[PDB]
Design a protein around this ligand. Sequence first.
Ligand SMILES: *[C@@H]1O[C@H](CO)[C@@H](O)[C@H](O)[C@H]1NC(C)=O
Lengths: 406, 395, 395, 425, 409
Amino acid sequence: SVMEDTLLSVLFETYNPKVRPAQTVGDKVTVRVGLTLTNLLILNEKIEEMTTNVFLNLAWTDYRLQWDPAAYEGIKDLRIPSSDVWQPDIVLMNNNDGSFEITLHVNVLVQHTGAVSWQPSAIYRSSCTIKVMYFPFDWQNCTMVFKSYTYDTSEVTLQHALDAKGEREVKEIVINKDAFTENGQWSIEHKPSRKNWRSDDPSYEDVTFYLIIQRKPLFYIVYTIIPCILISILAILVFYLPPDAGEKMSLSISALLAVTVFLLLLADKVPETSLSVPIIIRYLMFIMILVAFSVILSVVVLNLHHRSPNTHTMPNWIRQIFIETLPPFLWIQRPQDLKEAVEAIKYIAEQLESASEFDDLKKDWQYVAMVADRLFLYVFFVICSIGTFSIFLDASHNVPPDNPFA
Amino acid sequence: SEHETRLVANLLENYNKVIRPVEHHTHFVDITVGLQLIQLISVDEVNQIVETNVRLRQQWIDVRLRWNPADYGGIKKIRLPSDDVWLPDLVLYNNADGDFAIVHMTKLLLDYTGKIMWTPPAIFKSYCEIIVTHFPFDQQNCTMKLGIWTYDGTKVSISPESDRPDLSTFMESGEWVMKDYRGWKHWVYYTCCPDTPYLDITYHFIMQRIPLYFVVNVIIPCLLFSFLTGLVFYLPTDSGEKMTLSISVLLSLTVFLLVIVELIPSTSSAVPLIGKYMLFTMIFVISSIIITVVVINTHHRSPSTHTMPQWVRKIFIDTIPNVMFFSTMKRPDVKSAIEGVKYIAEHMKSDEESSNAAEEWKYVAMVIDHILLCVFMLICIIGTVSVFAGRLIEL
Amino acid sequence: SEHETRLVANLLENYNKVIRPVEHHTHFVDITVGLQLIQLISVDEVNQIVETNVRLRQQWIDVRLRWNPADYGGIKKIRLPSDDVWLPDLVLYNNADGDFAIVHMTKLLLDYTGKIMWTPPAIFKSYCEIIVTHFPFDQQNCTMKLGIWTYDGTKVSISPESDRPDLSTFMESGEWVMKDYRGWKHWVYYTCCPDTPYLDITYHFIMQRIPLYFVVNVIIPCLLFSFLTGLVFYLPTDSGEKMTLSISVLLSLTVFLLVIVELIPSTSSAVPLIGKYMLFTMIFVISSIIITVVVINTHHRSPSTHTMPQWVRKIFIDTIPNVMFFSTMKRPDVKSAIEGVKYIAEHMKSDEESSNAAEEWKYVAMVIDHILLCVFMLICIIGTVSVFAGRLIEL
Amino acid sequence: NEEERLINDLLIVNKYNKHVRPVKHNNEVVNIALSLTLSNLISLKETDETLTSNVWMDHAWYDHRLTWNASEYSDISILRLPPELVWIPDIVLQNNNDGQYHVAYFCNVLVRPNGYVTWLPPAIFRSSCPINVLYFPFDWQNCSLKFTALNYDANEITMDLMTDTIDGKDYPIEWIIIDPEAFTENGEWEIIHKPAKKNIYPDKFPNGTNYQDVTFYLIIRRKPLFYVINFITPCVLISFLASLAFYLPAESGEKMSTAISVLLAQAVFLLLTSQRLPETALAVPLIGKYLMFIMSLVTGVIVNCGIVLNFHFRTPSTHVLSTRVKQIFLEKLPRILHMSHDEIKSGIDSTNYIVKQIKEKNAYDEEVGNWNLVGQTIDRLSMFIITPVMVLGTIFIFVMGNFNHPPAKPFEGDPFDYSSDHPRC
Amino acid sequence: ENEEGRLIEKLLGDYDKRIIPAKTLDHIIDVTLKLTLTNLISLNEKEEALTTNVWIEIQWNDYRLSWNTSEYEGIDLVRIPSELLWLPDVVLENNVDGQFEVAYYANVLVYNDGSMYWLPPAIYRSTCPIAVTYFPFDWQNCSLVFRSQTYNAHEVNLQLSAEEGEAVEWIHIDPEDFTENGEWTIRHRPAKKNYNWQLTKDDTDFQEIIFFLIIQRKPLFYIINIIAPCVLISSLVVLVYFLPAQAGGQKCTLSISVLLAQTIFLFLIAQKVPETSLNVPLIGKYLIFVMFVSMLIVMNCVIVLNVSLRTPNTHSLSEKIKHLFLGFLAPEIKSCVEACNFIAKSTKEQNDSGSENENWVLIGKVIDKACFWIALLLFSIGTLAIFLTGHFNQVPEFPFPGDPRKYVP
Ligand SMILES: *[C@@H]1O[C@H](CO)[C@@H](O)[C@H](O)[C@H]1NC(C)=O
C-alpha cells in the first residue's frame, strides 16, 4: 500500500543496519533464542555429524523501528526483508562444516512497539561426539550451540524464547506435530534447553539445545545378530558330528568363512573411532574366537580318532580320565600237503587274532575321541550360551537417563 | 544508537579500503596473527590432506579509524563488517584443496584507538606428508603455513601471538591424540636483495593415532588365521580334510584381504605395518598349504612302486621320535582245496608285508607333521612378535 | 584505448538491458543457436542422465549497439561483459539435475553493426531415456532440447546454425562412439491460439557403447563358470567330490554376483542381455547340481532295499551303451568246522550277488553321467550362442 | 520500442517498491495460485530417503501497480520483467533435504495490462520422504512436496491451487501436471497417484507462517525387476538346493558340504541386501524377512543332517540299538512314508576260530546296516517335513509381497480420485 | 598519510576494467604465463581427472596504470585488487568441472611503468585420459591447456614467461617445499605454445599454452595388496598333481577353491581398474589368464580322477593303452572240499580285479606327472611374461619423441 511505502520511507531514512540498537551507551539488547525442530535428518556416525532441519525463533527489540499506527491507517506490523534491519549474528557454533549462518533469510516481522521477530530456516550440520560402546544399542547426546558470533554479554543478553501466548519461557526444543517427521532410526527421549557460561571467560554466553536420542537397532539386530546366532549354533553342532563322517572341518571352517563374511558386511557400518569397541564388534569377535576354538578342538578330536597302536602308545592318564572317569558323568558308558594246509590255516587264524587285538586298541582310541567330543559339546554349549546372554543383557541394560541433566 | 550511527557515518566517509593503514608508505602494518584450533575434522592418508576447523585471530592498528570517545557519548568499541575496512590477505600456503584465504567475512571489533580485532572462522585443508610406515601405530606431523600473499615484510609484517597455537577449546578427536604443537616465524630472503624479508608463520601439530579401531578390526583376525594355518599340521591325513582346512583358511584370509583393502589407506609411498603383517600371513598360509601337499603325498606313498630310502628310515623312524619326549607316539579235489588254502595264506603274507611298508610311510609322514607343527607354531609366534615389537617398544 | 573507453561509455549510457533489441515491439529478435560438443563426460544408465561439456554459441543483432567506426578511431569490434546487454534466456528443457540456463557469464563479441556473438561454456545434464535391452552392446539415442523459456516465437525466434552439432573439437570418449548427430527445430502450437508458435531446437546424439570393459569383466567369467558346470558329469562318483566341485562352482557364481551387481546398471525398465545370460548360467549350475544329486543317489543304491526296475535295466544297461560311440566303456568239532566252512561259502554266495546288483546300479549311474555330459555341453554352447549371437550378428 | 517507455513509467516514474505487497490497503490478501509441473522424476534413493525431482513452479497473482492502459501506449498486451524488479511471493519447499528452498532459475515474469502476473521458474528439489520398507522390493512409496509461504502470514497472502476451465466452469487443479508427451518414465518408479491439496491447520493462528500449506503428493510404485532377477530368484533356487541334502546318501560324505555352502551363498545374498536399504526400524523388509526365514531353515537342515550323520555312523562297539528305536524307525515310519593226531586237532581249532570271528564280523556288519537304515528313515522324514515348509513359506511370503498394490484411491476417507481426467464437478 | 592512497585514487579514476589496454589499433597485449606446481593432489582413474594445486603467474602491461615516481615520493609499486583491473581471461580449458577461473583473486602488483604482476593460486581438475594398457605399471601424460577465453590472437599474445633471457619452457617445481604425491612421481614437465591450425587468428582458441605432466605410477600398493597375493594363490593350482587320485585326495577341492579365491580377487580388482574400454589392463589380463589356467587344471584333475578310478566292470583296459602309457611314458567231505575250492576261486577273482585297478591308478599317476610339468611351465612362463611386459614399460627418455631437448632448467 501507499501508507506502507510512506512508513518504510520514514523508518529507514537514517536507519543503519550495521549499528546495534542501543538507546544509551552501555545498554544491552535482549535476544530470545528458540528452536523448532522440523526434521532430524541424519546422525552420520562415520563423520560424527548430525543433520537437522530447524527454525530459529529469534526475537528482540529495536527502538528505532517504532511508529504510531494511528498515524498510518492502523498498521500494527510490517514484513521487512531481513537484510534491511539489524540482526544479532546468531550462528551455530559447533557446526561440522563451515556454515555458521542460516540458510533461508525469511523477512522479519516488525511491530509498532519496535519488537522484531525473525524465524529463519536452516539445514544445520552440527558436530556431536559418538559414544561407541553400546553401538548399535546406543543412545546419543547431540547438542546445538547457538550464540551471537560477534556480540558478547556486554552487548547482547541471550534468553529463552516465549511460548505462543508469551507468559513463561520455553526451555525445550519446540516440535510442531503438523510439520515433524520421525527419523525412523532415532527416538527423541529428551530435548531440553539451557544457557551456558564459562568460569574462565566472563564475556561468553550461549543457548544450547540438547537432543537425547536413542537408536532403534532392528536393522542391525536382523542383519548381524540373527546370522551370528545361527553360526554359533553351527559351532556347537560341529561336536555332534561323528569323526567318521569326514565333515567336521567343513562345518567349522565354513562357519569361520561365514563369520568373516558378516564382518565384511558390518565393516562399512560401524564408526571408526578408537575410544571404545562397540558391543556388536565385541560380539562378532567373541563368535569368531568361539568358532576358531571349535576348529581347534575339532582338529584335536580328529587327531585322537585316527590314532592306532602302529603310531601311538596310549598313556595311563588319558585312559583314566576319558575311559574310566568322564563317561559316567557325560552318560556315554560305551602227508606233506596236509601239514602245509594245517600250517596255512593256523597262520590265517593267528592273523585274524592279531587284527582283532589291533582293532580293539583302535576302538579304545576312538572311544576316547568320542568322550572328548561330547565334553567339548557340553562345554561349548555352556560357554556360548553364557557369553551371548551376558552380552545381550549388557546391551539391553543401556538406557538413556530419566533426567537429561541439562 | 544515534551516537554510533553518527560515528559510523563519519568514520567511513573518506575511507578507502584499498589503501594500507599506515601513516607513511615507508612504514609497515604489524599484524598479530594467532591460530586457534577448534576441531580436527579428519586426516586423509591417501591424499595427504588434513582438515581442521580453526579461528584465525588477527590484530592490527588502523590509524584512519580512530575517534575521540568524548564526542560520541563515551563509545569506545564498535563492531564493523570486515569488508568495509582494509584487511590483510593472509593465505594458507600449503592449502591442499580448500580455500586459500578467509571466506567468512565476519564482523570485526574496532577500538577507539584504531586497534582492530578480527577472528574469522575457517576450514583449513592443508597438504602434509603422511608417513604410513608404522600404521596404525603411526605419528603424524602436519603443518599450516600462513603468510601475506602480495606484501613483503617491509610493507606488512606478521608476528605470532604466542609460541603455541591455542588449543584451549579443542575438541577431543577420538582418532588422534595431540602430542605437541608449536608456532614458528621464518624470515626468507632471495638472491635478488637481502633488504626485503618474506615472512611466514608455520604451525605444526604432532598427532598420535589411537590404534584401537584398526587393531581390533584388522590385526586380531590375522592373528587367528595365522594360528589356524599353523594348526593344520595336527590334523591326520587319514581324515581327508587337510586341504579343506588349509584352503578354507586361505579363503577366509582372502575375504579379510577384501576387508583390509576396504579399511586401511591405499597409499603407495611405503608399506605399512599392517601391509607387512598381511603379506607375512599370506606367505605363511601358502607355505602351510605347500608343505601339507608334500605330507599328503608322502603319506599315500605306494610301497609297490616306492621303497623307503635308508636315510629316511634312519632319521624319521629311529632318532627323531626318541627326542620327542612330550609326544605319545610309539618309539582228487582235496588237492585243489589244499592248494587254495595255501594260496590264501600266501596272499595274506603279501598283504601283511605291503601294509607294514605303507604303515612305515604313514609313520614318517606323521613325524614330519609333528616337526612342522612345532616349527610353524614357533614361526607364527616369532613373526607376530617381530613384526610389531619394534614399534611397540618404540612407544 | 581511450577511443574504446569513449565508445563503451556512449553505447551503454541509455541502454536498458531488460528491453528486447527490437525497433518495434511487434518485431522479433532472430537468434542463431549452435551447439559445440567438446566432451561427453559420462552417461548414467540408472538415473538416465547424460553429462556433456558444451559451448552454446548464440548470435543476434542488437540495433541499439550500433556505432560508426570512423567516429572512434576505426574500431570495428569490442568485447563486452554479457551481463551488460540484453541476453536470450535459453534453457535446457530436458535438464535433469544441472543448471537450466547459462551460468558462466563470459564476455561477448560486438561488431559495429550490432551483430553479437556469444559462446558461453556450460555443463549439460540432460534426461536420457536409456534402453538396456542390449547392454552392453547397446546404442543410446538421447537429446538436448533448447528453447527460450519466457518468450514465444513472435517475440524471440531461434534458428539452428547448422543441421548438426559441431563436433570439431570433440574429445574421444573411450566408452562411447559418436555414430550420428543432428539438430531439428520444432514449432509447437496450443489449443489457445494458432498465432503463437513455441520454438525449440533439439540436438540428438546416437552413441554406441564400446563393449570391452563389460565383456572382459563380466561375460568371460560367466563363460568359465558355464564351461565348468558340465564338467562335473565326467567326474566319477567314487571320488567324493561331485558335490564339492559343483557347489563350489555355484559359490563362485554367487560371489561373482557381487561384481555383476556393482558393475551393471540397476535399472528395472528391462532385463539386460548379460542379465539374461547370468540368469541362464545360474539356472544351468543349479540344474547341474540337482541332477548330480540324483546321480549320486543312484550310484549308491543298495540291492537290499532297492531292486532295479525292468525298464531301467532295458534302457540304461542294454540300449543306450550301444549307441554311445564316443565312450570306451564296455557293452566232535570236525562237524562244526565243516558246517562253518559251508557257512562261509554261502556267505560269499550272498556277498557276490549283492555286489553284482550294486555294480549294475553303479553302471547305470555312469551311463547317465555320460549322457548328461553330452547334453550339458550341447546346452551350454547352444544357450551361449542363442543369447549373444542374436544381438551380435546385428552389429 | 514502446516497451521501454512503458516499463520506465511502471517501475521508475510510479516509484515501484518491490518489498511491498501489491495491496491498495494493508488489510487485504494477495491470492497466489500455484501449480506444479513434473518435468521428470530423477531418483528416490532409499538409503538416505531423498526424492530428487525436476519441477516447474507455476505462479499467478495480481499486482495493481503493474497495470496500464494498452491504448495509451502501443497495443502492448504483455511484458517480460525480471523477478528482481518486481515483488515476488517467496514460496519455498519446506521439507527439503540439502538446504535448497528456492527455485533453481529466476526467469522473467509475464505481466498483462490488467495486472495479472504469471511466473514459471524451474527447480531441482531434494525433498525428504520416509521410506516404507515393509514390502521391499514390492513396495510403493508416498513422497510429498510441501510448499509454504514463510515471508507473509495467512492474513496477508493466501496460497491456492491454480484453476483451469474446460466448458465455462473453472475447477481447481488438484493434481501435479505431467505432460504425457515430454515426460519420460523413471527407470525404477511408476507414478500411480499425484494429488495436490491446500492444507489449513486450525490449531495454529492466521497471523503466522505455519498456518497455510500447499502440498503435492506422489504415490509411486517400484518396478520389481532388477531385484527379482538379481536377488530373489537366485536366492530362492540356492535355498531350495538345501533340500537335496536329504536325498544325498550319507555314504557320499557331502551332505554337510552341500547344506553349509548353501548357507554361505545365503550369507552372500544377505551381504548384498544389507546395502540396498536404509537403517530404519519401523519394520523388517520383506526380502529381509525371507532371508531370515530361509537362513533359519537352512540352519535347521544342517542340524538335522548332522543328526542323521550321527545316527548313520553308530556301531555296536559304541551304541546300543534299542528295541524302541528299531520299532519306530524300521517298522512304523518306513511303512508310513512308503519307503522302498594233535596236528589235525590244531587245524580244526584254527578253522573253528576263523568261523567264529567271521560270524561276529557278520553280526557287527548287519547291525551297522540297521543303523544305516535308521539314518535313511530319518532323512526321508526330514525331507517330507521340511521341503513342504520351505516351499510353502517362500510361496506365501512372495505372494503376500506380490499382493501389495496401492489402494487405488489416495486419502482413504476421500472418495475423489484426484485425477486430471475427472476434475471436481 | 599514505601517498599510495592519492596515487591509487588517481590511477583508478577514469579507469574502465572492461577496456583492453591496447594503446592503438593493431596493438597486441603480450601476456606471459608461468605455472608453478605446488601439489599433485590426485589423478582419479575412475573420473579421468587430474587435480592439481598451482600458482599461475600472469604478466602484462597496462599503459593506463603508469605514473611518474618523482611525483609520488618515489613509489614504484602498489597493490590493487584484481577485481578492479582489466585482466586477460586466461582460463583452464580442459577442466572436468565447470571451474575455469583461479581459486583466489590475489592483488595485482602494479609497477610505475605499467608492468603488472599477478600471481593467483588455483585448484584445477583437468581432463587426463588414461592409458590403461599397463595398469598398474603405467605412466600417464596429463596436460593443462591454458588460453584466453575472451580475446583472440589479434588482441592478446600468450607467451611463456622468460627469465634471464631464457624461456621457462617447463612447469616450475620448487625442489625443497614440493612434496611427492605418494602414488605418482613426475618424470617430465615440458611447456610449449600450441596452435590450432584448423582455426584462424580469431576464435580465441587459435593459440594456447600447454603444460604437460608425464607422471609414472608407483605400483607398490597393488603389488603388496593385489599382485603378490594373487600370484601366490594362483600358483597353488600346480600342487593338485601331487595329491592322490581317490576319495580324500581333494584335487578338485584345492583347484576349485583356488578358482573361487581368484573370483574374489576379480571382485577386488573390479573396484580399482578404470571403466574405459579401449584396452584391457595388465592386471585384468593376468586375472583372465590365471582363471583360464585354473579352469584347465580343474578339467585335468577331473580327467585324471576319471582315469584313476576306472574298474574292469565299467571300462576295459586295452593292452594298447597299457603299452602307450606304462611303456613309452562221505558227502560231508565232498561238500567241504567244494566250499574250499569256491572260496579259493572267489579270492583269486577279487585279487585279479584289484590288480587291474592298480594298473589304472599307475596310468593316472603317469598322466599327473606329465601334465604337472606342462602346467608348471605354462603358469611360470605366462606369469613372468605378463608381469615383465609391465616392468619394461618405461617413460620415454624425452618429453617429445623426436625433440632432442629435455625441457628442464
Ligand atoms: C617526474 O616528475 C618530476 C618532478 O617531480 C620531473 O622532474 C620529472 O621530469 C618527471 N618525470 C618524467 C618522466 O616526466
